[PDB]
Design a protein around this ligand. Structure first.
Ligand SMILES: Nc1ncnc2c1c(-c1cnc3[nH]ccc3c1)nn2C1CCCC1
Length: 257
């Protein structure tokens, strides 16, 4: 591939994360370029490289960009560096307190835009969640982790393994509650089985405090029982972009949103 780089052109400076497959470092590439670096802790090599095999085919400003690879053990996947790390940490940290609806709606729209690309390219994420969204300067968000947590997963997908772009739309509705509670785990107080039993019976999370009903109505569309009645990402993107003129032209900031 043209993606391949020499091992000595990489310097891993700061560990950012660790996990059951390996780790993520902040580093440099060709002594000039800030980069995120992912390692395979010697998962199968074929298994771990599938992510970059995908990120080679998908280019878009709201998807984290692959830069380079090292395809022999030890493996290295090199992408653009996102300075604020996961959206989940972002919302839960010192910035969460300063975010209001216009910022969060904007981030949602950026994500929707990324997912609209995925929709058009005919892929399926299957783990779309705030913990898998990355954030950079000036509130840029990007879809990441193209490598199942029940609370984020559509019923048909969790029960019958029917994973589609429509089950990603379902996750997006959950991710909207994460944006509007600023990182809270969805379905507060409920364990997995209780979530699954309840969602099947037609339970849906209620409108989060200070969140406008019009936004909770959007979540509710993403959580329709019939996958094909859920809106497209193109639709969601357009709605979120237009939100403050078309839907809440008289919105006022509150204490939290
Ligand atoms: N690109 C990044 N920039 C800044 N921080 C990043 C990341 C990633 C990250 C996310 N997805 C990835 N896929 C391949 C490498 C890779 C690295 N992960 N992380 C942190 C690791 C804990 C969550 C955020």
């Amino acid at each position: 591939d043209a993606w391949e780089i020499p091992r000595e052109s990489l310097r891993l400076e700061v560990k950012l994360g660790q996990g059951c497959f390996g780790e993520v470092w902040m580093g440099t590439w060709n002594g000039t370029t800030r980069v995120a670096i992912k390692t395979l802790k010697p998962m199968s090599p074929e298994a771990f490289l599938q992510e970059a095999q995908v990120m080679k085919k998908l280019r878009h400003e709201k998807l984290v960009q692959l830069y380079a690879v090292v395809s022999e053990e030890p493996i290295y996947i090199v992408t653009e560096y996102m300075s604020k790390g996961s959206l989940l940490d972002f919302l839960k940290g010192e910035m969460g307190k300063y975010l209001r609806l216009p910022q969060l709606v904007d981030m949602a729209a950026q994500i929707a835009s990324g997912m609209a690309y995925v929709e058009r390219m005919n892929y399926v994420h299957r783990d779309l969640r705030a913990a898998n969204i990355l954030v950079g300067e000036n509130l840029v968000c990007k879809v990441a982790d193209f490598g199942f947590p029940i609370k984020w997963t559509a019923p048909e997908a969790a029960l019958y393994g029917r994973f589609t772009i429509k089950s990603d739309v379902w996750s997006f509705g959950i991710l909207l509650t994460e944006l509007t509670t600023k990182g809270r785990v969805p379905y507060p107080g409920m364990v997995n089985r209780e979530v699954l039993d309840q969602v099947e019976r037609g339970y849906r999370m209620p409108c989060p405090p200070e969140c406008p009903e019009s936004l909770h109505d959007l979540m509710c569309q993403c959580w329709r029982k019939d996958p094909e009645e859920r809106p497209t990402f193109e639709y969601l993107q357009a709605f979120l972009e237009d939100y403050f003129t078309s839907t809440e032209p008289q919105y006022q900031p509150g204490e939290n949103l």
